Amino acid sequence: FAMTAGSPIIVNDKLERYAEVRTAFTHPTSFFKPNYKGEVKPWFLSAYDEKVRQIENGENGPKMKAKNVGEARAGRALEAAGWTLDINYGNIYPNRFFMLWSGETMTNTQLWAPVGLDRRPPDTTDPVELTNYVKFAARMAGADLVGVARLNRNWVYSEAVTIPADVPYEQSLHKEIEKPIVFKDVPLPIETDDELIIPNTCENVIVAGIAMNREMMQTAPNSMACATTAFCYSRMCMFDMWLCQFIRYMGYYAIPSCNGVGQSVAFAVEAGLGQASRMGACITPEFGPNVRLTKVFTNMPLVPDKPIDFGVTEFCETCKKCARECPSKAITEGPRTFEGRSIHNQSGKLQWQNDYNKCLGYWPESGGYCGVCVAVCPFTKNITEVWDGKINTYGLDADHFRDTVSFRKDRVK
Amino acid sequence: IRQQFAMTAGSPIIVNDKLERYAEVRTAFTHPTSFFKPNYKGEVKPWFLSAYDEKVRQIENGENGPKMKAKNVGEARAGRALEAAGWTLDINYGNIYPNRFFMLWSGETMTNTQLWAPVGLDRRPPDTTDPVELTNYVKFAARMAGADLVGVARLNRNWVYSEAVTIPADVPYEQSLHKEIEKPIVFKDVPLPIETDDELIIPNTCENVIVAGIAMNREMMQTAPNSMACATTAFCYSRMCMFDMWLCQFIRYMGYYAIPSCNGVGQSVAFAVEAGLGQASRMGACITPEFGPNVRLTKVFTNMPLVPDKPIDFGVTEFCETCKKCARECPSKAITEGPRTFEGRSIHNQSGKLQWQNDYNKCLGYWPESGGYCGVCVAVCPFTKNITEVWDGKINTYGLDADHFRDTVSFRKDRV
Ligand SMILES: Oc1c(Cl)cc(Cl)cc1Cl
Ligand SMILES: Oc1c(Cl)cc(Cl)cc1Cl
Ligand code: SF4
Ligand code: SF4
Ligand code: SF4
Ligand code: SF4
């Protein structure tokens, strides 16, 4: 489908769109992991067993002794709660639950129907004004970072993981299917029984960074690192809906995504949020790798942001600290290559190729989402002290929040 | 500052033997005698549909508020698009129906609770019962959940509506605004919060209310009664919803029960004054030291053992006594200039507590006229301190301000 003009990502002729089912989370060869008694479950139920084992043993992480059982119970209570606004870890099913590709059935849209903002032709078509408007709205909607790229279809999954439109939530995990994402000359995003169809007019992607909390993430791989993670996933989801509603009420269409539809790191790099790293995350100037990503696709005319260079590639060439502290040795200590390390990597793009089945393998063992690489990364800079220590709204840091102040001069040039 | 002005314990709200609990249906939004308002053409409609007509006409005429011209139709349109989108996570302006949609009184049905079922966090009895430790856990959770301010108070049932506006549980959303009913809120010796066909039953073990302040954006609010004050208001209603759900789940995963409310179930201002977030003012809001009245409230009710905070006293009553600025700026002359009394001006007030008594039907009346939620009182109040410049000016995450965001940093010392 061809690269966007000016993409920083180096690719070759082997590049092919990547089927979502191949992530270590969903793929048949990775999805099953031993629990701490040797039974092979879905990886996240094995992880559930370790989470309960730790609570019964007064631990906050793998052999990390908590103050008492009550503190161990509290960290997992806070992490479970964090996921409140997220379906089945990642909101990946397109046009289901919170990820509707059309706003028409939404309660919010129905309440506002007499105004008809979603039916009224745009009053603004100038991309400069629109970029400013949508970025203001993106920050209201909880983004700490927001960039705009031209949509590069190489990062959009060839097929999505989803459930059929008639499967209730309580059977969803047992009925996940694959479904192609195709681009057609259609007026609006539409889903048929056969296809998820993105219009050919869907020209831009808006990428949002959702800042995690450094104190909690520095506890990786233990429970409070899980908590700052889970809370950001619900913020991503609020963001996607807020922003998608705004764009529709401006007279355009918007596709939400969270962890679905496409690969966030590639979009974020192309939208100027940061650079790809050895660990594989987007490293951002404001938060390093310790930030979540979500994205919204739209036909709204916009000004694309310039990709940014602050030396991450060269730094990662000489650093290797995530690789050394990775508990599963998933992160390569070697050069970037074009050839994926296993099924889980998309071949054809120059990157540090890491073994993500080894990464996922450490989650049931540790009972968490690890994140040790993010915590030890130099761009990112006990559990009782966290609970008793500094906190602020949404886990944002006052001592840092000045850096994400935005004036129109920072939103559009 | 907050410690310098701590009162001794006991509700700061002065009452007399007349005070009775208040039926929610009496608010100016819901009561049959105030619900209808004329649109600019003179047609009588539900207040929000007349206000809708004003919104459409202002866009069409390139305005951001009542005969306030916008830079162009496009800017007028953008402001209303931002307003409408802010409300995404809110049902019918306030989430008032208890145990419906986002305000579920139990967590068992929620998708998050189902996903986490195998760990069983909400079946496991509490591993912590010490109220000091729990106050610190739930406050830290509350800040993670989007509260800028969080307080704890013993639940005062005077401020709990005697009957709630709600909808039958099997009514689809499209029909909800035509099928609102009343339903009593009663306290009984039951283990869990429970809804029957006839009652909303809060257990007698529901000892406490956790009150959350959710800060609005000062630049946008200072554009009141125009569209951008409506947008910071709308976005904070969705934050209040997410707060309620986040915190309720945390409390349940800690092994207690939790009731969310947003604008339903009871009177947020009274709870906030008793929880120590601020004091009542002439306009009738809770004025906080960090934000003035420019903050929204929501609350969660729980049997979780907690340490009540102290009510606050930083001179607001004395100041409002001689200020009268909101009363003079109020476009509908809704705010009284006189002394506080125990008798409300109309059905919309709850008599029996000493307060400034305002005409809230005059207030609602100005919302269809101006096409917004006004807020001139909040914006002009000294404790709080064009739209093209706002759109091009300072913004940060969630509309919060870096220059003041240090004021809400919290450590254990501050929480319990
Ligand atoms: O991205 C995540 C997903 Cl999809 C699932 C889990 Cl359990 C954790 C994380 Cl950090
Ligand atoms: O508090 C509000 C309610 Cl209940 C309804 C609307 Cl439409 C606006 C506001 Cl600011
Ligand atoms: S999350 Fe943990 S296991 Fe996975 S790559 Fe990073 S450090 Fe290694
Ligand atoms: S720890 Fe070092 S090599 Fe790894 S991503 Fe961070 S800077 Fe790059
Ligand atoms: S919102 Fe406006 S009309 Fe209502 S009391 Fe305040 S100033 Fe008066
Ligand atoms: S404007 Fe003056 S009288 Fe009105 S609430 Fe604020 S301080 Fe009190």
Task: Give the angle A212-A218-A221 at the CA atoms, nearest 5°.
Answer: 100
Whether A297 contacts chain B with CB within 8 A: no
Give how far Cα B19 sits from Cα of A24, B106, B133, Å: 62, 31, 35
Specify the residue with its C-alpha closest to ligand 6, atom 7: B320
- Check: CB of residue B21 under 8 Å from CB of residue B160: yes
CB contact under 8 A, B127 and A80: no
**DSSP codes, B72-135:** SHHHHHHHHHHHHHHGGG-STTT--STTSTT--S-STTSHHHHHHGGG-TTTSPPS---HHHHH
Ligand 4 center from residue A276 Cα (angstroms): 10
- Most distant CA atoms of chain B, gap in Å: 62
CB contact under 8 A, B136 and A387: yes
Q: Which of B245, B235, B283 is nearest to B81 (CA)?
A: B235
Whether A167 contacts chain B with CB within 8 A: no
CA dihedral B105, B111, B115, B117 (to 10 degrees): 30
Q: Does the beta carbon of A233 sit less than 6 angstroms from any atom of ligand 1?
A: no
**Peptide bond before residue A221 is cis, with ω within 30 degrees of 0:** yes
Contacts of B90 in chain A (CB under 8 A): 108
Residue B248 DSSP one-character state: H
Residue B17 DSSP one-character state: T
* Cα(B311)–Cα(A331) distance, integer angstroms: 54
Q: Which of B363, B362, B365, B368 is nearest to B48 (CA)?
A: B368
CB contact under 8 A, A80 and B249: yes
Give how far Cα B262 sits from Cα of A109, A137, A237, B91, B178, Å: 20, 23, 20, 10, 21
Whether A137 contacts chain B with CB within 8 A: yes
Residues 307-336 of B with CB under 8 A from A: none
* Cα(B270)–Cα(B21) distance, integer angstroms: 12
Tally of CB atoms within 10 A around B218: 20
Q: In a 3-state reduction of DSSP, which class is residue B274?
A: helix
Specify the residue with its C-alpha closest to ligand 6, atom 8: B320
- Check: CB of residue A411 under 8 Å from CB of residue A136: yes
Q: Which atom of ligand 6 is nearest to the CA of B377?
A: 1
Whether A226 contacts chain B with CB within 8 A: no
Ligand 4 center from residue A373 Cα (angstroms): 8
Specify the residue with its C-alpha closest to ligand 3, atom 4: A359
Of all residues in chain B, the one with the smallest CA distance to A78 is B250
Pairing mode, strands A40-42 and B295-302: unpaired
Q: Which of A242, A85, A394 is nearest to B150 (CA)?
A: A394
Structure tokens at B343: 């008798």
Give the residue carrying structure tokens 């529901």: B206
CB contact under 8 A, A88 and B249: no
Structure tokens at A265: 């790191």
Q: In a 3-state reduction of DSSP, which class is residue B59?
A: helix
- Check: CB of residue A229 under 8 Å from CB of residue A369: yes
Residue list, ligand 3 pocket, CB within 6 Å? A 279, 326-328, 330-331, 359, 362, 370-373
CB contact under 8 A, A407 and B393: yes
Query: Residue A278, class by beta-carbon neighbours within 10 Å (0-12 exposed, 13-18 middle, 19+ buried)?
Result: buried
Structure tokens at B260: 């969310």
Structure tokens at B72: 């162009």
- Check: CB of residue B302 under 8 Å from CB of residue B259: yes
Structure tokens at B122: 């909400």
Contacts of B412 in chain A (CB under 8 A): 387-389
Out of A107, A133, A394, whose CB is closest to B144? Answer: A394
The number of helix segments (H) and strand segments (E) in chain B equals 14, 14
Task: Give the angle A167-A173-A174 at the CA atoms, nearest 5°.
Answer: 75
Q: Which of B86, B66, B69 is nearest to B388 (CA)?
A: B69
What is chain A's alpha carbon radius of gyration, rounded to the nearest angstrom? 21
Of all residues in chain A, the one with the smallest CA distance to B92 is A111
Ligand 5 center from residue B376 Cα (angstroms): 6
Whether A144 contacts chain B with CB within 8 A: yes
- Check: CB of residue A209 under 8 Å from CB of residue A288: no
**DSSP codes, B379-410:** HH-TTT--HHHHHHS-B-GGG--HHHHGGG-B
Task: Name, in order, each residue with C-beta under 8 angstroms of A288's C-beta and a sequence gap of 6 or more.
Answer: A374, A377, A378, A379, A380, A381
| Preferred mutation among B58, B171, B397, B412 to probe A, highest tally of A CBs within 10 A | B397
Task: Give the angle B401-A212-A300 at the CA atoms, nearest 5°.
Answer: 70
**CB-facing half-sphere around the CA of A180: CA atoms within 13 A:** 7
Give the residue carrying structure tokens 């629990």: A35
Residue list, ligand 2 pocket, CB within 6 Å? B 48, 93-94, 233, 263, 373
* Cα(B314)–Cα(B299) distance, integer angstroms: 23
Q: In a 3-state reduction of DSSP, which class is residue B313?
A: coil
Enumerate the β-bridge partners of residue B289. none
Alpha carbon A391 to chain centroid, angstroms? 23
H helices of B263-401, in order, are 268-274, 316-323, 325-329, 360-370, 376-380, 387-392
Q: Does the beta carbon of A336 sit less than 6 angstroms from any atom of ligand 4?
A: no
* Cα(B108)–Cα(B253) distance, integer angstroms: 11
CB contact under 8 A, A74 and B410: no
* Cα(B104)–Cα(B258) distance, integer angstroms: 9
Query: Residue A119, class by beta-carbon neighbours within 10 Å (0-12 exposed, 13-18 middle, 19+ buried)?
Result: exposed
- Check: CB of residue A197 under 8 Å from CB of residue A190: yes
Task: Name, in order, each residue with C-beta under 8 angstroms of A318's C-beta and a sequence gap of 6 or more.
Answer: none
Q: Which of A338, A365, A347, A343 is nearest to A355 (CA)?
A: A343
The angle, 0 to 180 degrees and rounded to 10, between the axes of the packed helices B47-60 and B360-370 is: 30
Residue A120 amino acid letter:
R
Out of B78, B93, B408, whose CB is closest to A392? Answer: B408
* Cα(B88)–Cα(B195) distance, integer angstroms: 26
Residue list, ligand 6 pocket, CB within 6 Å? B 281-283, 319-320, 323-326, 380-383
Residues 332-361 of B with CB under 8 A from A: none
Structure tokens at A196: 């998820």
Q: In a 3-state reduction of DSSP, which class is residue B185?
A: strand
Residue A95 amino acid letter:
N
Chain breaks in chain A (C to N over 2.5 A) after: 381
User: HEC states along chain A?
Assistant: CCCCCCCCCCECCCCCCCCHHHCCCCCCCCCEEECCCCCEEEHHHHHHHHHHHHHHCCEEECCEECCCHHHHHHHHHHHHHHHHHCCCCCCCCCCCCCCCCCCCCCHHHHHCHHHCCCCCCCCCCCHHHHHHHHHHHHHHCCCCEEEEEECCHHHECCEEEECCCCCCHHHHHHHCEEEEEEEECCCCCEECCCCEEEECCCCEEEEEEEECCHHHHCCCCCHHHHHHHHHHHHHHHHHHHHHHHHHHHCCCCEECCCCCCECHHHHHHHCCCCEECCCCCEEECCCECCEEEEEEEECCCCCCCCCCCCCHHHHHHHHCHHHHHCCCCCCCCCCCECCCCCCCCCCCECECCCCHHHHHHHHHHHCCCCCHHHHHCCCCCCHHHHHCCCECHHHCCHHHHHHHCECHHHHCC
Q: Which of B129, B141, B130, B210 is nearest to B410 (CA)?
A: B141
Task: Give the angle B155-B139-B191 at the CA atoms, nearest 5°.
Answer: 45
- Check: CB of residue B131 under 8 Å from CB of residue B305: yes
Contacts of A211 in chain B (CB under 8 A): 397
Structure tokens at A399: 């001592």
Residue B265 DSSP one-character state: S
| Preferred mutation among B395, B404, B408, B414 to probe A, highest tally of A CBs within 10 A | B395
CB contact under 8 A, A390 and B406: no
Structure tokens at A70: 């009550």
Q: Is A6 left (phi over 0), alpha (psi -120 to 50) or beta?
A: left
Q: Which of A335, A333, A21 is nearest to A177 (CA)?
A: A21
Task: Name, in order, each residue with C-beta under 8 angstroms of B402's C-beta and a sequence gap of 6 or more.
Answer: A398, A401, A402, A404, A405, B396
Total residues belonging to chain B: 416
* Cα(A31)–Cα(A40) distance, integer angstroms: 10
The angle, 0 to 180 degrees and rounded to 10, between the axes of the packed helices A223-249 and B73-86 is: 140
Distance from CA of B394 to the nearest CA of A (A): 5
Q: In a 3-state reduction of DSSP, which class is residue B182?
A: strand
Structure tokens at A221: 């791989």
